[PDB]
Amino acid sequence: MEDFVRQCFNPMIVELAEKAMKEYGEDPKIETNKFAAICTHLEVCFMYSDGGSKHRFEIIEGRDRIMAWTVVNSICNTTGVEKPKFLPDLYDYKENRFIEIGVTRREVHIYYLEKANKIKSEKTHIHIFSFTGEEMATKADYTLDEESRARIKTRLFTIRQEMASRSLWDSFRQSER
Amino acid sequence: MEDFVRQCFNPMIVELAEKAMKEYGEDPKIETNKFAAICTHLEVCFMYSDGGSKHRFEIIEGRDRIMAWTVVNSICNTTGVEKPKFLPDLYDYKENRFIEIGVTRREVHIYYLEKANKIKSEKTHIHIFSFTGEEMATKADYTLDEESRARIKTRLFTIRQEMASRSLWDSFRQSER
Numbered sequence: 001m002e003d004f005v006r007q008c009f010n011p012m013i014v015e016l017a018e019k020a021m022k023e024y025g026e027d028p029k030i031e032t033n034k035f036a037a038i039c040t041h042l043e044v045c046f047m048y049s050d051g052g053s054k055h056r057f058e059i060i061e062g063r064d065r066i067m068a069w070t071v072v073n074s075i076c077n078t079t080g081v082e083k084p085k086f087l088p089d090l091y092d093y094k095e096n097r098f099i100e101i102g103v104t105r106r107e108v109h110i111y112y113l114e115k116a117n118k119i120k121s122e123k124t125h126i127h128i129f130s131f132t133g134e135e136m137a138t139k140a141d142y143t144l145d146e147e148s149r150a151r152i153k154t155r156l157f158t159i160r161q162e163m164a165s166r167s168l169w170d171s172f173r174q175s176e177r
Numbered sequence: 178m179e180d181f182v183r184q185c186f187n188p189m190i191v192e193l194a195e196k197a198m199k200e201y202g203e204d205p206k207i208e209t210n211k212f213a214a215i216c217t218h219l220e221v222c223f224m225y226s227d228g229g230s231k232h233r234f235e236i237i238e239g240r241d242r243i244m245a246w247t248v249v250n251s252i253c254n255t256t257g258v259e260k261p262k263f264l265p266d267l268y269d270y271k272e273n274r275f276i277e278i279g280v281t282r283r284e285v286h287i288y289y290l291e292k293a294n295k296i297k298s299e300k301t302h303i304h305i306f307s308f309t310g311e312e313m314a315t316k317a318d319y320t321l322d323e324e325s326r327a328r329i330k331t332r333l334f335t336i337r338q339e340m341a342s343r344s345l346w347d348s349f350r351q352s353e354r
């Protein structure tokens with residue numbers, strides 16, 4: 001499964017995911033399922049920022065903490081949106097709202113509630129994807145057009161199928177907590 | 178002039194420029210002209226990666242060293258372009274070449290020769306801009322359309338004029354070495 005992650009995600013995603021695990025004292029060579037999960041969430045974030053206009057989305061995830069907070073504070077100073085308590089994943093210029101992105105192997109609506117009851121931010125939007133293609137977001141607002149969204153689930157499904165082809169999906173489907 | 182830099186470039190550029198100076202033991206509060214010069218070169222790089230298609234350009238400048246080399250090595254492994262000796266500023270997918278970007282207050286052709294005689298990379302392209310609007314590149318190839326290029330010189334001219342309005346341009350025009 002370690003080899004699979006490296007042959008599945010581009011090297012910039014791999015590097016980003018290892019740094020994040022090491023920053024928390026976890027070994028990518030060992031927590032291979034968390035490894036893959038960080039990569040997938042990272043790749044989905046890059047794809048969300050790709051739908052819509054060329055500059056619709058400022059991306060927060062994947063930057064070091066200092067730059068990440070530099071972006072968010074800069075947006076709050078210019079537009080006046082409330083400053084989130086936690087680093088969210090993107091900013092949506094067209095709609096004036098921070099976005100949180102979740103990717104779960106579990107059921108989509110439970111993960112919604114989990115990250116709703118902990119976000120406590122009125123003006124931060126939650127958008128959740130599954131590998132089985134069930135997506136769940138806030139106030140029934142899903143931001144991107146069905147076409148951008150479809151490309152993301154298709155990518156997520158494609159990951160699922162090759163993990164299964166290498167017989168990794170079952171263990172990857174249990175590890176989540 | 179310190180205040181001018183902060184009121185002229187977006188906070189992400191300021192932060193990036195301070196980190197680079199501190200990484201070399203220079204004080205942004207003191208070397209205020211180098212400060213502005215790092216910011217301008219950074220902003221021009223972001224604008225070059227903006228002309229052309231949405232994904233024409235992979236950007237190298239502005240990333241930490243590890244990620245920066247992660248990008249370049251990843252490109253060389255996939256396409257087979259020669260691996261540069263120094264970190265360049267962008268990659269051009271449409272043309273299969275690394276780009277170096279220079280911004281000078283001095284004369285454009287001298288800076289071309291300076292960064293040609295030190296690059297020693299056959300397959301790295303040099304593109305130089307001035308605040309007075311004179312631009313100079315390799316093999317007379319200038320990559321972007323006249324329209325993207327014009328927007329960059331217009332921005333550069335606009336910087337020059339407000340430095341002059343605050344009477345900073347003359348000292349900023351001498352400091353370069």
Ligand SMILES: O=C(O)c1nc([C@@H]2CCCN2C(=O)Cc2ccc(Cl)cc2)[nH]c(=O)c1O
Binds near residue numbers: 087103
């Ligand atoms: O979408 C999500 O679930 C999501 N969750 C997080 C959680 C909560 C804050 C810390 N954290 C980590 O994951 C850091 C970490 C990274 C690697 C390991 Cl081994 C362990 C932890 N942070 C997000 O930015 C985010 O988008």
Ligand SMILES: O=C(O)c1nc([C@@H]2CCCN2C(=O)Cc2ccc(Cl)cc2)[nH]c(=O)c1O
Binds near residue numbers: 197280
């Ligand atoms: O375009 C250019 O002139 C250009 N020049 C450089 C030079 C050569 C390599 C180091 N360096 C610095 O500037 C680091 C530095 C940053 C701040 C201070 Cl205070 C001093 C030095 N590096 C580029 O990436 C680049 O694009």
Ligand SMILES: [Mn+2]
Binds near residue numbers: 061089
């Ligand atoms: Mn995040």
Ligand SMILES: [Mn+2]
Binds near residue numbers: 089
């Ligand atoms: Mn997230």
Ligand SMILES: [Mn+2]
Binds near residue numbers: 238264
């Ligand atoms: Mn550079």
Ligand SMILES: [Mn+2]
Binds near residue numbers: 266279280
């Ligand atoms: Mn440069």
